[PDB]
Amino acid sequence: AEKDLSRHGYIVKAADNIKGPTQLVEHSDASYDVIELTCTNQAKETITVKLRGENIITYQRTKARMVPFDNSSPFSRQLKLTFVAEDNPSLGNLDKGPYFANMDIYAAEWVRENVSSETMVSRPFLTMTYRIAIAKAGASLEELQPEADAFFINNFGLSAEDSSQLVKLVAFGDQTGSKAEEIESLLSCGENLPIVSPNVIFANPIFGSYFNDEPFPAPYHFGGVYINAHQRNAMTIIRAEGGREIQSLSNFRLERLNRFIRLQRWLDLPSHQLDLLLTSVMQADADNSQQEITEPVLKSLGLFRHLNLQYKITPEIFSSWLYQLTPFAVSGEIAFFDRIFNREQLFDQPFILDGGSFTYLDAKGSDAKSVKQLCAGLNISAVTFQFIAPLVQSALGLEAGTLVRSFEVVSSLYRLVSIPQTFGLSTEDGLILMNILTDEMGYLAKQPAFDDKQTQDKDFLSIILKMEALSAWLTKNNLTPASLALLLGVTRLAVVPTN
């Protein structure tokens, strides 16, 4: 929802054993890209196979013979692959062990990666993975991926074959040791449906056009993110046939789920906030393109546990600290974001989250002023606002006099306000402590980071823990941040010569 996808394409993830389309192009005459895949059966049986790959679009029309075809619009956009014997007839595959190489594809935008500094380039937005096998024998699964059965035994107590039973809710809930209300609380495919803030604009009528019919927001947009890994074909209940059944269950998603629900037991949280927090973390990390369980994630959970316990920190808060605020809710409540701003109507217009900017430095333009004032409605004093805003603008890289009505600005501000407030420190004071710790005031304005060049000045989490500790020490010693900073020479005291 946050970007257009009307034009986009796919490229082969660069790998030394695969050759093919590595860059997107605005136009081509070729019906399909050609790909060649080098692979080896564990017998060191090594072969290469050609394959065809093509971007494909599909659309619908009514037989309204009176109007012209009026076709131009955003449209569903999909990827199709096809092997043919005609391109690989020589390979004579009868005896070869059936197992061969991985295949991977980036779904990618192509744009000036620096709208100023040119860089018109294709650039990824999603990644996906496949394994290819070749077996003239029409071999069995026990030949193809025998490891699966061992997995299903150890993790499901069953043969991989038993998945075909597991597809039904009864077998599923049984083997999982779960009751189906939990499952709908997981799937949101029934009444536990997602909800969206009315006051928020989206990048494209991806779902706004006439023929759009995906229920919006989708579970793969919210609440079902990690388990569906953003794939449009999300898992759902489906009407029965000799009992109720599940939409679609790749073993990949099955093992994701197997992990997920155990973690859910241990943390004791509803699925929506768990998924929310999890995605917030993994998407904040630039490295985890693959929605993978990783150390910073675990570390984040540790922090949440601790802070939730000590200060009753709501996971939404934590999530919107390390990532954007969420314009969504589960079926039953107002969205955290909209609650925070349109908490009540005090003006004519509700506050709304939009593209565009305003001259926050003075905002003499009535509308700009209105916007800024509504934002100042975020608890803090107007004067405080001006201490914060230049730092936010600078950290985000915006034009000095301007700010924009987007989550980035919002979240930055929210961090800077809320975090010290959790320690009862004024947002003003926070700047002082941050400089003391880092010689930077705007530190929390920045986005979280997990830089491999790990240094003390980088871990948000450690820094937060330090803020905690030192705050305790300060109050323990009956000190004051201003006094401390002055004594430490962080700021000069006002003096002048005298008679």
Binding site: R7, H8, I56, Y59, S72, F75, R77
Partner: protein, 631 residues
């Protein structure tokens, strides 16, 4: 509804997002997909729903009758070699039939066999088929309603409710009736928006049917004293066939156990009420019930008077007391049958020029001003605005008449509807020259058209402009039949008057379904003339007709093309509506063409049959106007 789905694809790297369809030679194509078809090296992109005959070269003008296929000379000569040039296009009907239309009728086949008739489709022998409606299956498609679309109505000439061949009759010529059965529409209640069972009569009738008018008037007055009711006199409306209206079942789609043959001029009067009606009118009631069941609204209206029944109108219009009796009997009818929303006065013409069995005076258009005022006032004050009935007129198709009609004063008296009798612009005897009967437009320089080259255009333009009338009160008719001649000469439009002009039930009057049975076919996914007939379209008047040279059999008629065009025009002009004249004679083909022409859309992506393939135009001919012939 009626959705279709299509797809396009490109190399995975291709960021593009235009709907794509590679180049191909122009064979025939069809449907909703994008196309980029090469022809004479020009590639013409499809702009509209593709049709079999939509040659792209001509399509430079109209790739479909709605718009041109736009094109560019993009291809290299190499690509011209790769694809080939389709330029030598030709029409081609399908090898077979994808959907049957015609059906057997043992009795019509016997009627052809009947040596007293010896009907043959070549006109060599009997020129009148008396083909019963049994020869065709129901063709109506289902369409989604739209408040913005003008109404579709139909007039049923209800005598068609009989054919003695059904029982074993047909020994006599007139025994070979139509046998038009309501069941077909009952199966498809969505088909029509408003329906009228045609004519109704009055005591004073001087016409030929007055025999029955008198006999039933006397029967009513025989019953009424025994019921304590007052006797009816002149001006009182009267039924035409009490058994038909209240006792039929078989040919009116009703459970035959409900039939009652005891109903007659001396017994019908107790039954003469909406609940008791167990004939044609009962069928109508059940039809509305099933319309509600479908969730659609069917409107019921009735015409008073008629071609034959116009006879007494001048005397009635003149006598204010008879006008009073008229209004009173009308009110009583509405009370007995509240299902009717509207009445339609059908006087062929007050100022004369209708049937010759008519009393007429050049004061009768004014008497009709009085009549309208009186009826309007009485009925409105009686039923109240919550149930305000509608008043309509069957407007004459000729300038000289409508000029005399004082219609602006009738509108000042609250006239609701103006159904224009836009048909039979030509007739098989009185006309000097062959011509179209219901053509929308007139040919170039049609003269003043008091005898030829008439058109709906010619009438409605005057009515909207010279009379200033809003066309929202105006409704256009399409006719479920052709008219024919013999010995026609297409150059001078001369023809053999007074001869065996081909028809169904009568000379010169070939009914549409019978036309399909004998002289034209569509079942091969394409309209074509058969049995010596050829499709012709006059580009002068833009009108369709069949022709046969062997006996100069000219036959103008409404066609899928013309009917669609009428719909297009009606929408374009925001007319009050359109209607099928003699609904008994269309199985639904041109009804579908009408819906589609007005732009109604089907519900499913499936049909009884697609009318599309039949919009293939008739063979080009420039039929000179009578002015062009004389000049």
């Amino acid at each position: 509804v009626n959705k279709y789905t299509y797809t396009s694809s490109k190399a995975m790297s291709d960021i593009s997002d235009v709907i794509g369809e590679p180049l191909a030679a122009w064979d025939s194509q069809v449907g909703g997909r994008v196309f980029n078809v090469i022809f004479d090296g020009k590639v013409y992109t499809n702009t509209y729903w593709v049709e079999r005959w939509q040659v792209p070269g001509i399509g430079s003008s109209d790739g479909n009758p709605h718009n041109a296929w736009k094109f560019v000379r993009a291809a290299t000569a190499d690509e011209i070699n790769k694809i080939g040039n389709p330029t030598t296009a030709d029409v081609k009907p399908t090898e077979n039939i994808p959907s049957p239309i015609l059906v057997e009728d043992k009795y019509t086949e016997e009627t052809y066999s009947r040596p007293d008739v010896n009907f043959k489709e070549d006109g060599s022998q009997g020129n009148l088929s008396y083909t019963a409606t049994r020869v065709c299956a129901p063709m109506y498609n289902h369409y989604v309603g739209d408040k913005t679309k003008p109404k579709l109505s139909a007039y049923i000439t209800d005598w068609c409710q009989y054919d003695a061949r059904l029982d074993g009759g047909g020994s006599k010529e007139e025994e070979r009736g139509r046998g038009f059965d309501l069941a077909t529409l009952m199966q498809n209640p969505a088909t029509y928006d408003r329906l009228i069972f045609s004519f109704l009569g009055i005591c004073g009738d001087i016409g030929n049917k007055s025999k029955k008018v008198q006999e039933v008037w006397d029967g009513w007055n025989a019953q009424a004293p025994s019921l304590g009711l007052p006797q009816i006199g002149k001006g009182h409306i009267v039924p035409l066939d009490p058994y038909g209206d209240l006792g039929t079942a078989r040919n009116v789609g009703l459970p035959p156990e409900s039939a009652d043959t005891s109903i007659e001029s001396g017994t019908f009067l107790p039954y003469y009420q909406q609940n008791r009606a167990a004939g044609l009118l009962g069928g109508l009631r059940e039809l509305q019930k099933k319309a509600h069941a479908m969730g659609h609204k069917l409107d019921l209206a009735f015409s008073i008077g008629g071609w034959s029944l116009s006879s007494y109108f001048s005397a009635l219009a003149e006598n204010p007391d008879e006008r009073r009796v008229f209004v009173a009997s009308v009110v009583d009818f509405f009370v007995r049958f509240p299902m009717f929303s509207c009445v339609d006065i059908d006087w062929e013409y007050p100022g004369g020029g209708g049937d010759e069995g008519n009393i007429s005076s050049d004061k009768d258009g004014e008497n009709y001003v009085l009549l309208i005022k009186e009826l309007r006032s009485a009925l409105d004050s009686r039923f109240g605005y919550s149930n305000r009935k509608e008043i309509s007129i069957a407007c004459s198709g000729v300038k000289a008449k409508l000029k005399k009609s004082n219609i602006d004063q009738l509108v000042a008296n609250g006239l609701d509807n103006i159904y224009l009798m836009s048909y039979d612009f030509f007739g098989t005897i009185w006309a000097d020259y062959i011509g179209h009967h219901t053509n929308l437009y007139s040919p170039k320089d049609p003269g003043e058209q008091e005898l030829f080259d008439l058109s709906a255009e010619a009438a409605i333009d005057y009515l909207h402009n010279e009379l200033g009338i809003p066309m929202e009160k105006i409704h256009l008719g399409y006719a479920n039949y052709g008219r024919s001649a013999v010995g026609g000469d297409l150059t001078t439009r001369q023809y053999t008057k007074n001869g065996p002009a081909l028809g169904t039930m009568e000379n010169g009057a070939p009914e549409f379904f019978d036309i399909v049975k004998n002289y034209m076919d569509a079942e091969h996914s394409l309209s074509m003339g058969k049995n010596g007939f050829v499709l012709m379209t006059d580009t002068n008047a833009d009108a369709d007709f069949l022709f046969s040279e062997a006996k100069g059999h000219f036959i103008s008629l409404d066609t899928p093309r013309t009917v669609k065009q009428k719909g297009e025009y009606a929408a374009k002009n925001k007319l009050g509506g359109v209607f099928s004249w003699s609904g008994d004679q269309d199985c639904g083909l041109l009804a579908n063409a009408a819906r589609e022409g007005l732009g109604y859309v089907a519900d499913s992506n499936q049909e009884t049959i697609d009318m599309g393939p039949l919009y293939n135009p008739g063979k080009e001919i420039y039929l000179k106007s009578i002015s062009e012939i004389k000049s």
